[PDB]
Amino acid sequence: SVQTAATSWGTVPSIRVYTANNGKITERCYDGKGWYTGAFNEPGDNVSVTSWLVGSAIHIRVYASTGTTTTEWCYDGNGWTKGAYTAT
Amino acid sequence: SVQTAATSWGTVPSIRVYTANNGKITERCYDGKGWYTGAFNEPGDNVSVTSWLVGSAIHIRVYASTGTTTTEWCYDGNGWTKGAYTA
Amino acid sequence: SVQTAATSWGTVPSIRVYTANNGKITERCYDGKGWYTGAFNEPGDNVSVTSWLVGSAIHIRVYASTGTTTTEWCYDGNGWTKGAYTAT
Ligand SMILES: CO[C@@H]1O[C@@H](C)[C@@H](O)[C@@H](O)[C@@H]1O
Ligand SMILES: CO[C@@H]1O[C@@H](C)[C@@H](O)[C@@H](O)[C@@H]1O
Ligand SMILES: CO[C@@H]1O[C@@H](C)[C@@H](O)[C@@H](O)[C@@H]1O
Ligand SMILES: CO[C@@H]1O[C@@H](C)[C@@H](O)[C@@H](O)[C@@H]1O
Ligand SMILES: CO[C@@H]1O[C@@H](C)[C@@H](O)[C@@H](O)[C@@H]1O
Ligand SMILES: CO[C@@H]1O[C@@H](C)[C@@H](O)[C@@H](O)[C@@H]1O
């Protein structure tokens, strides 16, 4: 069994769908034409997601969890980086 | 154990809550009065959801997953149809 | 064996991350400074969440599920209360 998370933005629209399969999370993308594979590739058994626009710039936060460890991954216009999130 | 997904829109507001129970996903709806059962009824062990408005017209996408198969279901103003999503 | 759900709002932004661990759901909060522990503390094995603004006032709904029972929890400016949601 796979586990999914999804977010969207604009009126086109843009959609992003994160799938946790056998300990690896991957990303599928839609921008008003076809579905394609996105840059996001990280380890996880469980995923959630949220996003917001600042003007016309999209920002995404993905919460990947393995055992009891949860890692935030940030997209802000160029590539994916680790975020300051702590489970405290 | 049951597994849920939720989305909302407007300021009333409107809420939709999708519950995966014993391999069947069902929908519960709120539009500012009571909670009622919605049209959505499909197979799944796991669910996620997202939605957006074009003017006052709502569009919903639900991602129902059994085993390794994930099926997208589209609402766009009259009834539910299969979408172009592929894993 | 943790399970997460996330929501966000505004352009700062504000983020809320709900974690289901060993039958207890807890909340972590971000408002543009640090990550801190939030007021939300309720029983559950599974969680989902959604939120909306009326002007600058946030409203949050969290769906906490144990076995076949799902309980709605409402935030509307002034702590957390049970909501009218039923699963039938
Ligand atoms: C343009 O790059 C694509 O879209 C971004 C918004 C991200 O979802 C990224 O993972 C993907 O590769
Ligand atoms: C600016 O800091 C980055 O983005 C914030 C909105 C948070 O997601 C934080 O954990 C992350 O390090
Ligand atoms: C108008 O129809 C009701 O609201 C729609 C947005 C959908 O949730 C549908 O399944 C439900 O029965
Ligand atoms: C118009 O195409 C339908 O809606 C798009 C926004 C996507 O959900 C796509 O998978 C679906 O087939
Ligand atoms: C101001 O209070 C903080 O923000 C609210 C929106 C809630 O997330 C609450 O549980 C949290 O402690
Ligand atoms: C005022 O009523 C409360 O708020 C609504 C938006 C719903 O979440 C409902 O379950 C709850 O009873």
Side-chain angles (χ1 to χ4, degrees), chain C residues 27-29 36-41:
Chain C
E27 177 189 40
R28 294 285 285 166
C29 312
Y36 67 89
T37 298
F40 188 87
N41 207 96

Side-chain angles (χ1 to χ4, degrees), chain B:
Chain B
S1 191
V2 300
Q3 194 259 302
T4 59
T7 189
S8 58
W9 68 89
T11 56
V12 175
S14 286
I15 310 163
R16 294 299 187 274
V17 183
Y18 302 83
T19 311
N21 183 10
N22 296 321
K24 275 221 150 168
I25 303 168
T26 55
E27 176 190 40
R28 294 284 285 168
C29 312
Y30 181 93
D31 299 314
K33 306 223 151 81
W35 285 93
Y36 66 96
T37 297
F40 188 88
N41 210 315
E42 302 295 346
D45 298 306
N46 169 270
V47 57
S48 60
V49 66
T50 190
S51 62
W52 66 96
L53 282 158
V54 174
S56 48
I58 192 64
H59 307 261
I60 310 169
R61 298 297 184 270
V62 175
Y63 301 84
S65 314
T66 286
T68 64
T69 309
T70 300
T71 314
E72 176 184 46
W73 291 105
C74 315
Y75 180 94
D76 296 288
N78 43 274
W80 290 91
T81 56
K82 273 198 203 152
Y85 175 81
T86 244

Side-chain angles (χ1 to χ4, degrees), chain A residues 52 61 63 72 74 76 82-86, chain C residues 12-13 15 30 32 35:
Chain A
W52 67 96
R61 296 298 183 270
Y63 300 95
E72 176 185 46
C74 315
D76 294 289
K82 271 181 274 210
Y85 175 82
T86 320
Chain C
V12 176
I15 310 168
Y30 181 93
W35 285 94

